[PDB]
Amino acid sequence: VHHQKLVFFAEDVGSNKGAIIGLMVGGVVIA
Amino acid sequence: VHHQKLVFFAEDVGSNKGAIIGLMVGGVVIA
Amino acid sequence: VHHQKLVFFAEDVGSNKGAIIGLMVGGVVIA
Amino acid sequence: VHHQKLVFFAEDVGSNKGAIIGLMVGGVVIA
Amino acid sequence: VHHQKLVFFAEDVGSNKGAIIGLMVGGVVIA
Amino acid sequence: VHHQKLVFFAEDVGSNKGAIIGLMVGGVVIA
Amino acid sequence: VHHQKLVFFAEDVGSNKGAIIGLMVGGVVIA
Amino acid sequence: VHHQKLVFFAEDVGSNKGAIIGLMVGGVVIA
């Protein structure tokens, strides 16, 4: 929270392919 | 919260393909 | 909240394709 | 709140395609 | 389209908590 | 499309907690 | 499409907890 | 597509806990 960049598919040159599914970092669920 | 960039699909040159599904960072649910 | 950029699909040159589904950062639900 | 840019589909040159669904940052619901 | 029910949070008894984010079924975007 | 029920959090009795993020079935994007 | 039920958190009795992240069935993206 | 049930956390009695992350069946991405 103090400092976060969070950057995806940035500064891409040429042909780029990919995909992101799910992926969870930290956080609290079901308390 | 202090400093966040949060940038996606920025400064893209040429052909770029991709997709983002779900993906959760931090946060609180079901308290 | 202090400083946020929040920029998507900006400064795009050429052909760019993509999609964003869901994606949650921080926040509070169900208190 | 102090400083926010919030910019989407800006400064786009050429052909650009994409879509945003949901996506929630911060905020408080159901108190 | 022929027959759809589409019912959420219906016939609820007692204490129920939950949330729905995104979620897309069918449909056509970016043609 | 011919026949769809699509029912969530229905007929709930007692205490129930949960959450749904993303989740995509079928559909066409980026054509 | 011919016949779909699609039912979640239905007919729940007592205490139930859980969460769904991502999860994709079928569909076409990036054409 | 011809016939799908797709049912999760249904007909639950008593105390039930669990979580689903990712999980992909079929579908086509990056064409």
Coordinates of N, CA and C in Angstrom, one line a residue:
Chain A
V1 N 0.9 -1.2 0.0 CA 0.0 0.0 0.0 C 0.9 1.2 0.0
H2 N 2.0 1.2 0.7 CA 2.9 2.3 0.8 C 3.4 2.7 -0.6
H3 N 3.9 1.7 -1.4 CA 4.4 1.9 -2.7 C 4.1 0.7 -3.6
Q4 N 3.2 0.9 -4.6 CA 2.9 -0.2 -5.6 C 3.0 0.3 -7.0
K5 N 3.6 -0.6 -7.9 CA 3.7 -0.2 -9.3 C 2.6 -0.8 -10.1
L6 N 2.4 -2.2 -10.0 CA 1.4 -2.9 -10.6 C 1.3 -2.5 -12.1
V7 N 2.2 -3.0 -12.9 CA 2.2 -2.7 -14.4 C 2.2 -4.0 -15.2
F8 N 1.3 -4.1 -16.2 CA 1.2 -5.3 -17.0 C 1.1 -4.9 -18.5
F9 N 1.7 -5.7 -19.4 CA 1.6 -5.5 -20.8 C 2.0 -4.0 -21.1
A10 N 3.1 -3.5 -20.5 CA 3.5 -2.1 -20.7 C 4.8 -2.1 -21.5
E11 N 5.0 -1.0 -22.3 CA 6.2 -0.9 -23.0 C 6.5 -2.1 -23.9
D12 N 5.5 -2.6 -24.5 CA 5.7 -3.8 -25.4 C 5.9 -3.4 -26.8
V13 N 7.0 -4.0 -27.4 CA 7.3 -3.7 -28.8 C 7.4 -4.9 -29.6
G14 N 6.7 -4.9 -30.8 CA 6.7 -6.1 -31.6 C 5.5 -7.0 -31.4
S15 N 5.6 -8.3 -31.5 CA 4.5 -9.2 -31.2 C 4.6 -9.9 -29.9
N16 N 3.6 -9.7 -29.0 CA 3.6 -10.3 -27.7 C 2.2 -10.9 -27.4
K17 N 2.3 -12.2 -26.9 CA 1.1 -12.9 -26.6 C 1.2 -13.5 -25.2
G18 N 0.0 -13.6 -24.5 CA 0.0 -14.2 -23.2 C -1.3 -14.1 -22.5
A19 N -1.5 -14.7 -21.3 CA -2.7 -14.6 -20.6 C -2.5 -14.9 -19.1
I20 N -3.3 -14.3 -18.3 CA -3.2 -14.4 -16.8 C -4.5 -15.0 -16.2
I21 N -4.5 -16.1 -15.5 CA -5.7 -16.7 -14.9 C -5.5 -16.8 -13.4
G22 N -6.5 -16.3 -12.7 CA -6.5 -16.4 -11.2 C -5.3 -15.5 -10.7
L23 N -4.4 -16.1 -10.0 CA -3.3 -15.3 -9.4 C -3.7 -14.4 -8.3
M24 N -3.5 -14.8 -7.0 CA -3.9 -14.0 -5.9 C -2.7 -13.8 -4.9
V25 N -2.5 -12.5 -4.6 CA -1.4 -12.2 -3.6 C -2.0 -11.4 -2.4
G26 N -1.7 -12.0 -1.2 CA -2.2 -11.4 0.0 C -3.7 -11.4 0.0
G27 N -4.3 -10.5 0.8 CA -5.7 -10.3 0.9 C -6.3 -11.2 2.0
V28 N -7.5 -10.9 2.4 CA -8.2 -11.7 3.4 C -9.6 -12.0 2.9
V29 N -10.0 -13.3 3.0 CA -11.3 -13.7 2.5 C -11.9 -14.6 3.6
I30 N -13.3 -14.7 3.6 CA -14.0 -15.5 4.6 C -13.4 -15.3 6.0
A31 N -13.9 -14.3 6.7 CA -13.5 -14.0 8.1 C -14.3 -14.7 9.1
Chain B
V1 N -2.0 2.7 -1.2 CA -2.9 4.0 -1.2 C -2.0 5.2 -1.2
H2 N -0.8 5.1 -0.5 CA 0.1 6.2 -0.5 C 0.6 6.6 -1.9
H3 N 1.0 5.6 -2.7 CA 1.5 5.8 -4.0 C 1.1 4.6 -4.9
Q4 N 0.3 4.7 -5.9 CA 0.0 3.6 -6.8 C 0.0 4.1 -8.2
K5 N 0.6 3.2 -9.1 CA 0.7 3.6 -10.5 C -0.5 2.9 -11.3
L6 N -0.6 1.6 -11.1 CA -1.7 0.9 -11.8 C -1.8 1.3 -13.3
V7 N -1.0 0.7 -14.1 CA -1.0 1.0 -15.5 C -1.0 -0.3 -16.3
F8 N -1.9 -0.5 -17.3 CA -2.0 -1.7 -18.1 C -2.2 -1.3 -19.6
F9 N -1.6 -2.1 -20.5 CA -1.7 -1.9 -21.9 C -1.3 -0.4 -22.3
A10 N -0.2 0.0 -21.7 CA 0.2 1.4 -21.9 C 1.5 1.4 -22.7
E11 N 1.7 2.5 -23.5 CA 2.9 2.6 -24.3 C 3.2 1.4 -25.1
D12 N 2.1 0.9 -25.8 CA 2.3 -0.3 -26.6 C 2.5 0.1 -28.1
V13 N 3.5 -0.6 -28.7 CA 3.9 -0.3 -30.0 C 3.9 -1.6 -30.9
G14 N 3.2 -1.6 -32.0 CA 3.2 -2.8 -32.8 C 1.9 -3.7 -32.5
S15 N 2.1 -5.0 -32.6 CA 0.9 -5.9 -32.3 C 1.0 -6.5 -30.9
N16 N 0.0 -6.3 -30.1 CA 0.0 -6.8 -28.8 C -1.3 -7.5 -28.4
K17 N -1.2 -8.7 -27.9 CA -2.5 -9.4 -27.6 C -2.3 -10.0 -26.2
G18 N -3.5 -10.1 -25.4 CA -3.4 -10.7 -24.1 C -4.8 -10.5 -23.4
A19 N -4.9 -11.1 -22.2 CA -6.2 -11.0 -21.4 C -5.9 -11.2 -20.0
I20 N -6.7 -10.6 -19.1 CA -6.6 -10.7 -17.7 C -7.9 -11.2 -17.1
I21 N -7.8 -12.3 -16.3 CA -9.0 -12.9 -15.7 C -8.8 -13.0 -14.2
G22 N -9.8 -12.5 -13.4 CA -9.7 -12.6 -11.9 C -8.6 -11.7 -11.5
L23 N -7.6 -12.2 -10.8 CA -6.5 -11.5 -10.2 C -6.9 -10.5 -9.1
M24 N -6.6 -10.9 -7.9 CA -7.0 -10.1 -6.7 C -5.8 -9.8 -5.8
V25 N -5.6 -8.6 -5.5 CA -4.5 -8.2 -4.6 C -5.0 -7.5 -3.3
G26 N -4.8 -8.0 -2.2 CA -5.2 -7.4 -0.9 C -6.7 -7.3 -0.9
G27 N -7.2 -6.4 -0.1 CA -8.7 -6.2 0.1 C -9.3 -7.1 1.1
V28 N -10.4 -6.8 1.6 CA -11.1 -7.6 2.6 C -12.6 -7.9 2.2
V29 N -12.9 -9.1 2.2 CA -14.3 -9.5 1.8 C -14.9 -10.4 2.9
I30 N -16.2 -10.5 3.0 CA -16.9 -11.3 4.0 C -16.3 -11.0 5.4
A31 N -16.8 -10.0 6.1 CA -16.3 -9.7 7.4 C -17.2 -10.3 8.5
Chain C
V1 N -4.9 6.7 -2.4 CA -5.7 8.0 -2.4 C -4.8 9.2 -2.4
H2 N -3.6 9.1 -1.8 CA -2.7 10.2 -1.8 C -2.2 10.5 -3.2
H3 N -1.9 9.5 -4.0 CA -1.4 9.7 -5.3 C -1.8 8.4 -6.2
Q4 N -2.6 8.6 -7.2 CA -3.0 7.5 -8.0 C -2.9 7.9 -9.5
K5 N -2.4 7.0 -10.3 CA -2.3 7.3 -11.8 C -3.5 6.7 -12.5
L6 N -3.7 5.4 -12.3 CA -4.8 4.7 -12.9 C -4.9 5.0 -14.4
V7 N -4.1 4.4 -15.3 CA -4.2 4.6 -16.7 C -4.2 3.3 -17.5
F8 N -5.2 3.2 -18.4 CA -5.3 2.0 -19.2 C -5.4 2.3 -20.7
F9 N -4.9 1.5 -21.6 CA -5.0 1.7 -23.0 C -4.6 3.1 -23.4
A10 N -3.5 3.6 -22.8 CA -3.1 5.0 -23.1 C -1.8 5.0 -23.9
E11 N -1.6 6.0 -24.8 CA -0.4 6.1 -25.6 C -0.2 4.8 -26.4
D12 N -1.3 4.3 -27.0 CA -1.1 3.1 -27.8 C -0.9 3.5 -29.3
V13 N 0.1 2.8 -29.9 CA 0.4 3.1 -31.3 C 0.4 1.7 -32.1
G14 N -0.3 1.7 -33.2 CA -0.4 0.5 -34.0 C -1.6 -0.3 -33.6
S15 N -1.5 -1.7 -33.7 CA -2.6 -2.5 -33.4 C -2.5 -3.1 -32.0
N16 N -3.5 -2.9 -31.1 CA -3.5 -3.4 -29.8 C -4.8 -4.0 -29.4
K17 N -4.8 -5.3 -28.9 CA -6.0 -6.0 -28.5 C -5.8 -6.5 -27.1
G18 N -6.9 -6.5 -26.3 CA -6.9 -7.1 -25.0 C -8.2 -6.9 -24.2
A19 N -8.3 -7.5 -23.1 CA -9.6 -7.4 -22.3 C -9.3 -7.6 -20.8
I20 N -10.0 -6.9 -19.9 CA -9.9 -7.0 -18.5 C -11.2 -7.5 -17.8
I21 N -11.1 -8.6 -17.1 CA -12.3 -9.1 -16.4 C -12.1 -9.2 -14.9
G22 N -13.1 -8.7 -14.1 CA -12.9 -8.7 -12.7 C -11.8 -7.8 -12.2
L23 N -10.8 -8.4 -11.5 CA -9.6 -7.6 -11.0 C -10.1 -6.7 -9.9
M24 N -9.7 -7.0 -8.7 CA -10.1 -6.2 -7.5 C -8.9 -5.9 -6.7
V25 N -8.6 -4.6 -6.3 CA -7.5 -4.3 -5.5 C -8.0 -3.5 -4.3
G26 N -7.7 -4.0 -3.1 CA -8.1 -3.4 -1.8 C -9.7 -3.3 -1.8
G27 N -10.1 -2.3 -1.0 CA -11.6 -2.1 -0.8 C -12.2 -3.0 0.3
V28 N -13.3 -2.6 0.8 CA -14.0 -3.4 1.8 C -15.5 -3.7 1.4
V29 N -15.9 -5.0 1.5 CA -17.2 -5.3 1.2 C -17.8 -6.2 2.3
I30 N -19.1 -6.2 2.4 CA -19.8 -7.0 3.4 C -19.2 -6.8 4.8
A31 N -19.7 -5.7 5.5 CA -19.1 -5.4 6.8 C -20.0 -6.0 7.9
Chain D
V1 N -7.7 10.7 -3.6 CA -8.5 12.0 -3.6 C -7.6 13.2 -3.7
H2 N -6.4 13.1 -3.1 CA -5.5 14.2 -3.1 C -5.1 14.5 -4.6
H3 N -4.7 13.4 -5.3 CA -4.3 13.6 -6.7 C -4.7 12.3 -7.5
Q4 N -5.5 12.5 -8.5 CA -5.9 11.3 -9.3 C -5.9 11.7 -10.8
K5 N -5.4 10.8 -11.6 CA -5.4 11.1 -13.0 C -6.6 10.5 -13.7
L6 N -6.8 9.2 -13.5 CA -7.9 8.5 -14.1 C -8.0 8.8 -15.6
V7 N -7.2 8.1 -16.4 CA -7.3 8.3 -17.9 C -7.4 7.0 -18.6
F8 N -8.4 6.9 -19.5 CA -8.5 5.6 -20.3 C -8.7 6.0 -21.8
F9 N -8.2 5.1 -22.7 CA -8.3 5.3 -24.1 C -7.9 6.7 -24.5
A10 N -6.8 7.2 -24.0 CA -6.4 8.5 -24.3 C -5.1 8.5 -25.1
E11 N -4.9 9.5 -26.0 CA -3.7 9.6 -26.8 C -3.5 8.3 -27.6
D12 N -4.6 7.8 -28.2 CA -4.5 6.6 -29.0 C -4.3 6.9 -30.5
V13 N -3.4 6.2 -31.1 CA -3.1 6.4 -32.5 C -3.1 5.1 -33.3
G14 N -3.8 5.0 -34.4 CA -3.9 3.8 -35.1 C -5.1 3.0 -34.7
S15 N -5.0 1.7 -34.8 CA -6.2 0.8 -34.4 C -6.0 0.3 -33.0
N16 N -7.0 0.5 -32.1 CA -7.0 0.0 -30.8 C -8.3 -0.6 -30.4
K17 N -8.3 -1.8 -29.8 CA -9.5 -2.5 -29.4 C -9.3 -3.0 -28.0
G18 N -10.4 -3.0 -27.2 CA -10.3 -3.5 -25.9 C -11.6 -3.3 -25.1
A19 N -11.7 -3.9 -23.9 CA -12.9 -3.7 -23.1 C -12.6 -3.9 -21.6
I20 N -13.4 -3.2 -20.8 CA -13.2 -3.3 -19.3 C -14.5 -3.7 -18.6
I21 N -14.4 -4.8 -17.8 CA -15.6 -5.3 -17.1 C -15.4 -5.4 -15.6
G22 N -16.3 -4.9 -14.8 CA -16.1 -4.8 -13.4 C -15.0 -3.9 -13.0
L23 N -14.0 -4.5 -12.3 CA -12.8 -3.7 -11.9 C -13.2 -2.8 -10.8
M24 N -12.8 -3.1 -9.5 CA -13.2 -2.2 -8.4 C -11.9 -2.0 -7.5
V25 N -11.7 -0.7 -7.2 CA -10.5 -0.3 -6.4 C -11.0 0.5 -5.2
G26 N -10.7 0.0 -4.0 CA -11.1 0.7 -2.8 C -12.6 0.8 -2.7
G27 N -13.0 1.7 -1.9 CA -14.5 2.0 -1.7 C -15.0 1.1 -0.6
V28 N -16.2 1.5 -0.1 CA -16.9 0.8 1.0 C -18.3 0.5 0.6
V29 N -18.7 -0.8 0.7 CA -20.1 -1.1 0.4 C -20.7 -2.0 1.6
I30 N -22.0 -2.0 1.7 CA -22.7 -2.7 2.8 C -22.0 -2.5 4.1
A31 N -22.5 -1.4 4.8 CA -21.9 -1.1 6.1 C -22.7 -1.6 7.2
Chain E
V1 N -32.7 -16.7 -24.6 CA -33.7 -15.7 -24.9 C -35.1 -16.4 -24.9
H2 N -35.2 -17.6 -25.3 CA -36.4 -18.4 -25.4 C -37.0 -18.5 -24.0
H3 N -36.2 -18.9 -23.0 CA -36.6 -19.0 -21.6 C -35.5 -18.7 -20.7
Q4 N -35.6 -17.7 -19.9 CA -34.6 -17.3 -18.9 C -35.2 -17.0 -17.5
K5 N -34.6 -17.5 -16.5 CA -35.1 -17.2 -15.1 C -34.4 -16.0 -14.5
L6 N -33.1 -16.1 -14.5 CA -32.2 -15.0 -13.9 C -32.8 -14.5 -12.6
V7 N -32.4 -15.3 -11.5 CA -32.9 -14.9 -10.2 C -31.7 -14.9 -9.2
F8 N -31.5 -13.8 -8.5 CA -30.4 -13.7 -7.5 C -31.0 -13.3 -6.1
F9 N -30.4 -13.8 -5.0 CA -30.8 -13.3 -3.7 C -32.3 -13.4 -3.5
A10 N -32.9 -14.5 -4.0 CA -34.3 -14.7 -3.8 C -34.7 -15.8 -2.9
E11 N -35.8 -15.6 -2.2 CA -36.3 -16.6 -1.2 C -35.2 -16.8 -0.1
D12 N -34.6 -15.8 0.3 CA -33.5 -15.9 1.4 C -34.1 -15.8 2.8
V13 N -33.8 -16.7 3.6 CA -34.3 -16.7 5.0 C -33.1 -16.8 6.0
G14 N -33.1 -15.9 7.0 CA -32.0 -15.9 7.9 C -30.9 -14.9 7.5
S15 N -29.7 -15.2 7.8 CA -28.6 -14.2 7.5 C -27.8 -14.7 6.3
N16 N -27.8 -13.9 5.2 CA -27.1 -14.3 4.0 C -26.1 -13.2 3.6
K17 N -24.9 -13.5 3.3 CA -23.9 -12.5 2.8 C -23.2 -13.0 1.6
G18 N -22.9 -12.1 0.7 CA -22.2 -12.5 -0.5 C -22.0 -11.3 -1.5
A19 N -21.2 -11.5 -2.6 CA -21.0 -10.5 -3.6 C -20.6 -11.1 -4.9
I20 N -21.0 -10.4 -6.0 CA -20.7 -10.8 -7.4 C -19.9 -9.8 -8.1
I21 N -18.8 -10.2 -8.7 CA -17.9 -9.2 -9.4 C -17.7 -9.7 -10.8
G22 N -17.9 -8.9 -11.8 CA -17.7 -9.3 -13.2 C -18.7 -10.3 -13.6
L23 N -18.2 -11.5 -14.0 CA -19.1 -12.6 -14.4 C -19.8 -12.3 -15.7
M24 N -19.3 -12.9 -16.8 CA -19.9 -12.7 -18.1 C -20.3 -14.0 -18.9
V25 N -21.5 -14.1 -19.3 CA -22.0 -15.2 -20.1 C -22.4 -14.9 -21.5
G26 N -21.8 -15.5 -22.5 CA -22.2 -15.2 -23.8 C -22.0 -13.7 -24.2
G27 N -22.7 -13.3 -25.2 CA -22.6 -11.9 -25.6 C -21.5 -11.7 -26.6
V28 N -21.6 -10.6 -27.4 CA -20.5 -10.2 -28.4 C -20.1 -8.8 -28.2
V29 N -18.7 -8.6 -28.1 CA -18.2 -7.3 -27.9 C -17.1 -7.1 -29.0
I30 N -16.8 -5.8 -29.3 CA -15.7 -5.5 -30.2 C -15.9 -6.3 -31.5
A31 N -16.7 -5.8 -32.5 CA -17.0 -6.6 -33.7 C -16.0 -6.1 -34.8
Chain F
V1 N -29.2 -20.3 -24.6 CA -30.2 -19.3 -24.9 C -31.6 -20.0 -25.0
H2 N -31.6 -21.2 -25.4 CA -32.9 -22.0 -25.5 C -33.5 -22.1 -24.1
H3 N -32.7 -22.5 -23.1 CA -33.2 -22.7 -21.8 C -32.1 -22.4 -20.8
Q4 N -32.2 -21.3 -19.9 CA -31.2 -21.0 -18.9 C -31.9 -20.7 -17.6
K5 N -31.3 -21.3 -16.5 CA -31.8 -21.0 -15.2 C -31.1 -19.8 -14.5
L6 N -29.8 -19.9 -14.5 CA -29.0 -18.8 -13.9 C -29.5 -18.4 -12.5
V7 N -29.2 -19.1 -11.5 CA -29.7 -18.8 -10.2 C -28.6 -18.8 -9.1
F8 N -28.4 -17.8 -8.4 CA -27.3 -17.7 -7.4 C -27.9 -17.2 -6.0
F9 N -27.3 -17.7 -4.9 CA -27.7 -17.3 -3.6 C -29.3 -17.4 -3.4
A10 N -29.8 -18.5 -3.9 CA -31.3 -18.6 -3.8 C -31.7 -19.8 -2.9
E11 N -32.8 -19.6 -2.2 CA -33.3 -20.6 -1.3 C -32.3 -20.9 -0.2
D12 N -31.7 -19.8 0.3 CA -30.7 -20.0 1.3 C -31.3 -19.9 2.7
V13 N -31.0 -20.9 3.6 CA -31.5 -20.9 5.0 C -30.3 -21.0 6.0
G14 N -30.4 -20.1 7.0 CA -29.3 -20.1 8.0 C -28.2 -19.1 7.6
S15 N -27.0 -19.4 7.9 CA -25.9 -18.5 7.6 C -25.1 -18.9 6.4
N16 N -25.0 -18.1 5.4 CA -24.2 -18.4 4.2 C -23.3 -17.3 3.8
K17 N -22.0 -17.6 3.5 CA -21.1 -16.6 3.1 C -20.3 -17.1 1.9
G18 N -20.0 -16.2 1.0 CA -19.2 -16.6 -0.2 C -19.0 -15.4 -1.1
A19 N -18.2 -15.6 -2.2 CA -18.0 -14.5 -3.2 C -17.6 -15.1 -4.5
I20 N -17.9 -14.4 -5.6 CA -17.6 -14.8 -6.9 C -16.8 -13.7 -7.7
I21 N -15.6 -14.1 -8.2 CA -14.8 -13.2 -8.9 C -14.5 -13.6 -10.3
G22 N -14.7 -12.8 -11.3 CA -14.4 -13.2 -12.7 C -15.4 -14.2 -13.1
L23 N -15.0 -15.4 -13.6 CA -15.8 -16.5 -14.0 C -16.5 -16.1 -15.3
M24 N -16.0 -16.7 -16.4 CA -16.6 -16.4 -17.8 C -16.9 -17.7 -18.5
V25 N -18.1 -17.8 -19.0 CA -18.5 -19.0 -19.8 C -19.0 -18.6 -21.2
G26 N -18.3 -19.2 -22.2 CA -18.7 -18.9 -23.5 C -18.5 -17.4 -23.9
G27 N -19.1 -16.9 -24.9 CA -19.0 -15.5 -25.3 C -17.9 -15.3 -26.3
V28 N -18.0 -14.2 -27.0 CA -16.9 -13.8 -27.9 C -16.4 -12.4 -27.7
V29 N -15.1 -12.2 -27.6 CA -14.5 -10.9 -27.4 C -13.4 -10.7 -28.4
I30 N -13.1 -9.4 -28.6 CA -12.0 -9.1 -29.6 C -12.2 -9.9 -30.9
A31 N -12.9 -9.4 -31.8 CA -13.2 -10.1 -33.1 C -12.2 -9.6 -34.2
Chain G
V1 N -25.7 -24.0 -24.5 CA -26.7 -22.9 -24.9 C -28.1 -23.6 -25.0
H2 N -28.1 -24.8 -25.4 CA -29.4 -25.6 -25.6 C -30.0 -25.7 -24.2
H3 N -29.2 -26.2 -23.2 CA -29.8 -26.3 -21.9 C -28.7 -26.1 -20.8
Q4 N -28.8 -25.0 -20.0 CA -27.9 -24.7 -19.0 C -28.5 -24.5 -17.6
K5 N -28.0 -25.0 -16.6 CA -28.5 -24.8 -15.2 C -27.8 -23.6 -14.6
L6 N -26.5 -23.7 -14.4 CA -25.7 -22.7 -13.8 C -26.3 -22.2 -12.5
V7 N -26.0 -23.0 -11.4 CA -26.5 -22.7 -10.1 C -25.4 -22.8 -9.1
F8 N -25.3 -21.7 -8.3 CA -24.2 -21.6 -7.2 C -24.8 -21.2 -5.9
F9 N -24.3 -21.7 -4.8 CA -24.7 -21.3 -3.5 C -26.3 -21.4 -3.3
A10 N -26.8 -22.5 -3.9 CA -28.3 -22.6 -3.8 C -28.7 -23.8 -2.9
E11 N -29.9 -23.6 -2.3 CA -30.4 -24.6 -1.4 C -29.4 -24.9 -0.3
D12 N -28.8 -23.9 0.3 CA -27.8 -24.1 1.3 C -28.4 -24.0 2.7
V13 N -28.1 -25.0 3.6 CA -28.7 -25.0 4.9 C -27.6 -25.1 6.0
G14 N -27.6 -24.2 7.0 CA -26.6 -24.3 8.0 C -25.5 -23.3 7.7
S15 N -24.2 -23.6 8.0 CA -23.1 -22.7 7.8 C -22.3 -23.1 6.6
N16 N -22.2 -22.3 5.6 CA -21.4 -22.6 4.4 C -20.5 -21.5 4.0
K17 N -19.2 -21.8 3.8 CA -18.2 -20.8 3.4 C -17.4 -21.3 2.2
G18 N -17.1 -20.3 1.3 CA -16.3 -20.7 0.1 C -16.1 -19.5 -0.8
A19 N -15.2 -19.6 -1.8 CA -15.0 -18.6 -2.8 C -14.6 -19.1 -4.1
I20 N -14.9 -18.4 -5.2 CA -14.5 -18.8 -6.5 C -13.7 -17.7 -7.2
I21 N -12.5 -18.1 -7.7 CA -11.6 -17.1 -8.4 C -11.3 -17.6 -9.8
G22 N -11.5 -16.7 -10.8 CA -11.2 -17.1 -12.2 C -12.2 -18.1 -12.7
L23 N -11.7 -19.3 -13.1 CA -12.6 -20.3 -13.6 C -13.2 -20.0 -14.9
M24 N -12.7 -20.5 -16.0 CA -13.2 -20.2 -17.4 C -13.6 -21.5 -18.1
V25 N -14.8 -21.6 -18.7 CA -15.2 -22.7 -19.4 C -15.6 -22.3 -20.8
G26 N -14.9 -22.9 -21.8 CA -15.2 -22.6 -23.2 C -15.0 -21.1 -23.5
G27 N -15.6 -20.6 -24.6 CA -15.5 -19.2 -24.9 C -14.3 -18.9 -25.9
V28 N -14.4 -17.8 -26.6 CA -13.3 -17.5 -27.5 C -12.8 -16.0 -27.2
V29 N -11.5 -15.9 -27.1 CA -11.0 -14.6 -26.8 C -9.8 -14.3 -27.8
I30 N -9.5 -13.1 -28.0 CA -8.4 -12.7 -29.0 C -8.5 -13.5 -30.3
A31 N -9.3 -13.0 -31.2 CA -9.4 -13.6 -32.5 C -8.5 -13.1 -33.5
Chain H
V1 N -22.2 -27.6 -24.5 CA -23.2 -26.6 -24.8 C -24.6 -27.2 -25.0
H2 N -24.6 -28.5 -25.5 CA -25.8 -29.2 -25.6 C -26.5 -29.4 -24.3
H3 N -25.8 -29.8 -23.3 CA -26.3 -30.0 -21.9 C -25.3 -29.8 -20.9
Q4 N -25.5 -28.7 -20.0 CA -24.5 -28.5 -19.0 C -25.2 -28.2 -17.7
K5 N -24.7 -28.8 -16.6 CA -25.3 -28.6 -15.3 C -24.6 -27.4 -14.5
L6 N -23.3 -27.5 -14.4 CA -22.5 -26.5 -13.7 C -23.1 -26.1 -12.4
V7 N -22.9 -26.9 -11.4 CA -23.4 -26.5 -10.1 C -22.3 -26.7 -9.0
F8 N -22.2 -25.6 -8.2 CA -21.2 -25.6 -7.1 C -21.8 -25.2 -5.8
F9 N -21.3 -25.7 -4.7 CA -21.7 -25.3 -3.3 C -23.3 -25.4 -3.3
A10 N -23.8 -26.5 -3.8 CA -25.3 -26.6 -3.8 C -25.7 -27.8 -2.9
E11 N -26.9 -27.6 -2.3 CA -27.4 -28.7 -1.4 C -26.5 -29.0 -0.3
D12 N -25.9 -28.0 0.3 CA -24.9 -28.2 1.3 C -25.6 -28.1 2.7
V13 N -25.3 -29.1 3.5 CA -25.9 -29.2 4.9 C -24.8 -29.3 5.9
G14 N -24.9 -28.4 6.9 CA -23.9 -28.5 8.0 C -22.8 -27.5 7.7
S15 N -21.5 -27.8 8.1 CA -20.4 -26.9 7.9 C -19.6 -27.3 6.7
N16 N -19.4 -26.4 5.7 CA -18.6 -26.8 4.6 C -17.7 -25.6 4.2
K17 N -16.4 -26.0 4.0 CA -15.4 -25.0 3.7 C -14.6 -25.4 2.5
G18 N -14.2 -24.4 1.6 CA -13.4 -24.8 0.5 C -13.1 -23.6 -0.4
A19 N -12.3 -23.7 -1.4 CA -12.0 -22.6 -2.4 C -11.5 -23.2 -3.7
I20 N -11.8 -22.4 -4.8 CA -11.4 -22.8 -6.1 C -10.6 -21.7 -6.8
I21 N -9.4 -22.1 -7.3 CA -8.5 -21.1 -7.9 C -8.2 -21.5 -9.3
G22 N -8.3 -20.6 -10.3 CA -8.0 -21.0 -11.7 C -9.0 -22.0 -12.2
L23 N -8.5 -23.1 -12.6 CA -9.3 -24.2 -13.2 C -9.9 -23.8 -14.5
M24 N -9.4 -24.4 -15.6 CA -9.9 -24.0 -16.9 C -10.2 -25.3 -17.7
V25 N -11.4 -25.4 -18.3 CA -11.8 -26.5 -19.1 C -12.2 -26.1 -20.5
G26 N -11.5 -26.6 -21.5 CA -11.8 -26.3 -22.9 C -11.5 -24.8 -23.2
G27 N -12.1 -24.3 -24.2 CA -12.0 -22.9 -24.5 C -10.8 -22.6 -25.4
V28 N -10.8 -21.5 -26.1 CA -9.7 -21.1 -27.0 C -9.2 -19.7 -26.7
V29 N -7.9 -19.5 -26.5 CA -7.4 -18.2 -26.2 C -6.2 -18.0 -27.2
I30 N -5.9 -16.7 -27.4 CA -4.8 -16.3 -28.3 C -4.9 -17.1 -29.6
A31 N -5.6 -16.5 -30.6 CA -5.7 -17.2 -31.9 C -4.7 -16.6 -32.9

